[PDB]
Enzyme design. Structure first.
Site, PDB file in Angstrom:
ATOM      1  N   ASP A   1       0.860  -1.162   0.000  1.00 44.16           N
ATOM      2  CA  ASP A   1       0.000   0.000   0.000  1.00 44.16           C
ATOM      3  C   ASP A   1       0.910   1.229   0.000  1.00 44.16           C
ATOM      4  OD1 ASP A   1      -1.880   2.112   1.368  1.00 44.16           O
ATOM      5  OD2 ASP A   1      -3.202   0.399   0.791  1.00 44.16           O
TER       6      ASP A   1
ATOM      7  N   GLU B   1       1.401  -0.784  -5.423  1.00 47.16           N
ATOM      8  CA  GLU B   1       0.286   0.045  -5.865  1.00 47.16           C
ATOM      9  C   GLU B   1       0.777   1.449  -6.192  1.00 47.16           C
ATOM     10  OE1 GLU B   1      -4.177   0.436  -4.975  1.00 47.16           O
ATOM     11  OE2 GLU B   1      -3.123   1.291  -3.192  1.00 47.16           O
TER      12      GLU B   1
ATOM     13  N   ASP C   1     -12.295   1.793  -3.565  1.00 49.00           N
ATOM     14  CA  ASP C   1     -12.004   3.195  -3.830  1.00 49.00           C
ATOM     15  C   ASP C   1     -12.696   3.712  -5.073  1.00 49.00           C
ATOM     16  OD1 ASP C   1     -10.255   4.072  -1.751  1.00 49.00           O
ATOM     17  OD2 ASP C   1      -8.660   2.806  -2.661  1.00 49.00           O
TER      18      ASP C   1
END
Ligand SMILES: [Ca+2]
Ligand SMILES: [Ca+2]
EC number: 3.2.1.135
Lengths: 585, 585
Positions: free
Chosen positions: A325, A354, A421
């Protein structure tokens, strides 16, 4: 021709080994501005007098502005120099070398690939190559253990509409109790958003990296899930947030106490002391002014060793990989070493960063295995959902990205249609299942690892966050079984057809008017053509088909046997219908 | 404009931090295609409704085909997302961003530079930023201890015409005795070729990476040289080979004497047995068919450790730098780690590799500090020596190579004129001192570390190997003190003018007719306009000088004071005369 448009570099995404003795070279040039690109190469220490070895670089595909040529240098010395020979439209020739462009081969120069060390060959988990990930948003998947529900948990209903502060009880136990479902579907791996100990509802501000958050479960329960998952042919992937920590992290809690007296002051990014304030902060955090998230100084050995220990622990627990992340926000060295550590413990543990921009820097083979393909999604959205771009653009967008990184990466990229998201794709498709489906048929046949967002399989729906986080639909009478079946089959075909998982891609057909696109997946002697009529009208099209690749396919979806007649293949697609043609080899 | 000519990336030599809060950015285009280049940027997490900062990228230069723009971005948050604004002759406004090109800012996406980590700011030693190395081939420099003289040594005469296997007895004790010579010259570090125990005339097949060769000296003798040089402002840079070993290496011996029964068989690249024979290789070596040089498997954790142990030792003896041959044929992970080690023992240890081709993958900042600027030699060896190319070309070849790497690398690049492998520059000039001088003058005022080959500072001429290794001329009578004092004065200047060592470079004037090239080194407010008149005639050229940079200059070489008028500077140069104008700031 236009030489200031031709490009290549003896490194990165344009020059890389695929085997200890095989180098992949790529060349970029203006579209149509070139017609024949050949590669003349030979061992670097070879006599200039000797004859160079030839190599033909086929047009791997083209985009909005460029054409891409790809060859394959066979090297025994493991070291090789090479110069290009670019033939244009009118038939003019030119040599392209490190030195520059010239009609003469000599004044052209020659690119060089120092050496091919096996340790620098991009290698990823074989299973990862052919797998289907399934993102689990724990809080809303399945509530299997009520006893761990947080206070004020709203009832679990289909007509529920989630709020930033809503809670439904989702936990690990539940995941286990549902494995049979997840198995039935065919997913081979589960992606778990943050499930570590944290006080917030988002759990992105880690409090204890060595403990599963209470509302979700505990080590015992996790180990169980892992095993129950593992035996059912499903892998586990945990979200690691190494960038920033939570304003409750033992290490940060001390700083907030002993101030400059704690042996942890240089574990974070602090300035004006003492350390505290309302809505103001003297320490660096995630994003802009986020007190509950103190950026971790992953550069300090100590801060490194801890995170690494955290990795070790969970590695021992039996997980199958990590989902980084906010990785691009942590020094590369950290990452370079992380991989090494992770790979020694488990050569098959996948590592997926990511990044929301050209991830080439982390995708050389020494850092991550892949990243979320935001690009794939965008292209998908605008082509199947909103109809902003036509099949031609769709082709270009798809093609441009493929060339972005080395195949090894290209092929592993996680292709999602959505996420917690973002709004649900069905919703993006304005409720039109037809579109949705076609989009899936594409994600399920395109280059790159398929990622299914929990729910989409049974047609869940929902607007942007937090509406995309509604609680999973479990009542069969309230599920889209027909969809679920559609998925099941696509998922199966992806296993039966090797081309779809380990094959390359090459555009087959594109029509900005008809708005129909088609690509082919090729591996060895096999072949699988995918036709998609992205329209609401019935259409027919003629596709080039040379006997060299076969003259009879099979729509793996309907069983219809299509026959080709002299390089041409007539096809009639129904609205938003998709065809998966298999040559037979 | 031709958009397929424009190129940029948020990494490598096109995006790199010069500091923890400053990001240098470079944009490439077709020469002429772009006129103005501005950069719009803001924090990565900034809001869209928010304003964007500005940065005017000035044409950093221009080579044969491209234009290069440069702009320094000031990022406090250490997170930058930018977008270019290009403008061509017709004033057409087109933006460039990660997405692509568009006359609409938003539609053009935006480049992004993840995070700026202080540990990732290419950092090189301060002293090396303004040093002047002196290549020493210990065999033919100074013979101070005859007790080591190998049987068959020759007479140290001005007429000695060396042979492929001659001998002169030169050794370390000689380097010590003759130090007062170097000090006088002004050098700041000496670069030796292989001086490790080896059975050969080149010693490129190391036998014991733990001791000086018997004929050169010993540990005590070595240290003495180190301390003695040190107390004279001179540093020591040893040349070690880590790619391969000698055939007598303690480990390889075991192998060539215990087939696969060797506890060192995985220390090399062996395919089968018998271990060896004359004209036969069952193992890989440097280049083709060179049994003496058995490639070391740097990928082996043991083989790596040893080399590191070798490093450690010599670094404890007090060395300050390393020059690595065939550095490109050894894995990155090795160098990355080697850099980290070295830097931990001595933060000011210089690490320079030898790569005869684009060395960007080694000059990112985590590996080498610099490489041998072979691009420089070639451009110099043709402009002042043979005259194959004119000023325009020269300007280009420079401006080009320059842009290969980041500014911190280009700046430490060793600019040699000749070496133990090539012919001496004077001989490339056909004994023409006039040309040679200017070269030296340029090589001593241009960007990059000046490397002086032993002897060339006193005129010492000579043909290619092994005629470039003629016995050092020590008899002052038979010496060109005129050159000596020329070199010296040059060195002194480069040490007085910040610009010449820590300044950037930009072309001032380049005329294909007169063949007169003039460049400018700059730092803060200082300027050093260097003008080179490469023509057997007394030509007079005009120079563009806006009253912003100054109106009065001084030629440090002569002391004359020139003045500019209405933004125009008239200078009269003599045949092959070099001028070094200081803006007096
Ligand atoms: Ca629960
Ligand atoms: Ca001697």
């Amino acid at each position: 021709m236009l030489l200031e448009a031709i490009f290549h570099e003896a490194k990165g995404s344009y020059a890389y080994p695929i085997s200890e003795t095989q180098l992949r070279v790529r060349l970029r040039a203006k579209k149509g501005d070139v017609v024949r690109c050949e590669v003349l190469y030979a061992d670097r220490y070879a006599s200039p007098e000797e004859e160079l070895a030839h190599a033909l670089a086929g047009k791997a595909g083209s985009d909005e502005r460029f054409d891409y040529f790809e060859a394959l240098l066979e090297c025994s010395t493991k070291r090789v120099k090479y110069v290009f020979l670019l033939t244009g439209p009118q038939g003019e020739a030119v040599y392209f070398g490190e030195t520059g462009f010239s009609a003469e081969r000599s004044k052209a120069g020659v690119f060089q690939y120092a050496y091919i060390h096996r340790s620098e060959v991009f290698t990823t988990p074989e299973w990862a190559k052919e797998a289907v990930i399934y993102q689990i948003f724990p809080e809303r998947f399945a509530n299997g253990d009520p006893s761990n529900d947080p206070p004020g948990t709203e009832q679990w209903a289909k007509d529920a509409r989630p709020r930033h502060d809503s809670f439904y009880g989702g936990d690990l136990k539940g995941v286990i109790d549902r494995l049979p479902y997840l198995e039935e579907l065919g997913v081979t791996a589960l992606y778990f958003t943050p499930i570590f100990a944290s006080p917030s509802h988002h759990k992105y501000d880690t409090a204890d990296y060595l403990a599963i958050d209470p509302q979700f479960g505990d080590l015992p329960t996790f180990r169980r899930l892992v095993d129950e998952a593992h035996r059912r042919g499903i892998k586990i992937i945990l979200d690691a947030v190494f960038n920033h920590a939570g304003d409750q992290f033992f290490a940060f809690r001390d700083v907030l106490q002993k101030g400059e007296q704690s042996r942890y002051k240089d574990w974070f990014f602090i300035e004006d002391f003492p350390v505290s304030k309302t809505s103001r902060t003297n320490y660096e955090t995630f994003a802009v002014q986020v007190p509950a998230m103190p950026k971790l100084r992953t550069e300090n050995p100590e801060v490194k060793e801890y995170l690494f220990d955290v990795a070790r622990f969970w590695m021992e627990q039996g997980i199958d990989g990590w989902r980084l992340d906010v990785a691009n926000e942590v020094d590369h060295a950290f990452w370079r070493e992380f991989r090494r550590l992770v790979k020694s413990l488990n050569p098959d543990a996948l590592i997926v960063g990511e990044i929301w921009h050209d991830a080439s820097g982390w995708l050389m083979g020494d850092q991550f295995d892949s990243v979320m393909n935001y690009l794939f999604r965008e292209s998908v959205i605008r082509f199947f959902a909103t109809g902003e771009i036509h099949a031609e653009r769709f082709d270009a967008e798809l093609t441009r990205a493929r060339m972005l990184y080395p195949e090894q990466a290209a092929q592993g990229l996680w292709n999602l249609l959505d996420s917690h998201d973002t709004e649900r794709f069905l919703t993006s498709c304005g409720g039109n299942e037809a579109k949705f489906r076609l989009a899936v048929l594409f994600q399920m046949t395109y280059l790159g690892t398929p990622l299914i967002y929990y729910g989409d399989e049974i047609g869940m729906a929902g607007a942007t966050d937090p509406d995309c986080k509604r609680p999973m639909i479990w009542e069969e009478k309230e599920q889209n079984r027909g969809l679920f079946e559609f998925y099941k089959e696509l998922i199966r075909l992806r296993h039966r057809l090797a081309s779809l998982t380990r094959g390359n891609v090459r555009s087959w057909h594109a029509d900005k008017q008809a708005n129909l696109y088609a690509f082919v997946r090729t591996v060895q002697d096999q072949h699988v053509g995918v036709v998609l009529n992205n329209r609401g009208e019935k259409q027919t099209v003629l596709l080039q088909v040379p006997e060299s690749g076969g003259k009879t396919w099979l729509d793996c979806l309907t069983g219809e046997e299509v026959h080709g007649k002299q390089g041409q293949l007539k096809l009639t697609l129904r609205p938003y219908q998709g065809m998966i043609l298999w040559n037979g080899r």
